[PDB]
């Protein structure tokens, strides 16, 4: 979904010029997978 200006959204990726940054940060929380420390990331 292209919204205008620089925004070309997929799922975490609403582009601007930096939607790869917020997308990567989002998936790094999702690779705690315990979720940014949501489950305490117990190891």
Swiss-Prot record:
Protein's job: Bactericidal activity; inhibits closely related Lactobacilli, Listeria monocytogenes and ivanovvi, Enterococcus faecalis, Carnobacterium sp and Brocothrix thermosphacta.
Species lineage: Bacteria, Bacillati, Bacillota, Bacilli, Lactobacillales
Name used for this protein in its record: Bacteriocin sakacin-P
Residues of the full protein shown: 19 to 61 of 61
GO BP annotation list: defense response to bacterium; killing of cells of another organism
Subcellular location: Secreted
Keywords recorded for this protein, A-Z: Antibiotic, Antimicrobial, Bacteriocin, Disulfide bond, Secreted
Cystine pairs: 9-14
Recorded superkingdom: Bacteria
Main localization (coarse): secreted
Native source organism of the sequence: Latilactobacillus sakei (Lactobacillus sakei)
Family: Belongs to the bacteriocin class IIA/YGNGV family.
GO cellular component, one term: extracellular region
Keyword Amino-acid biosynthesis belongs to the record: no
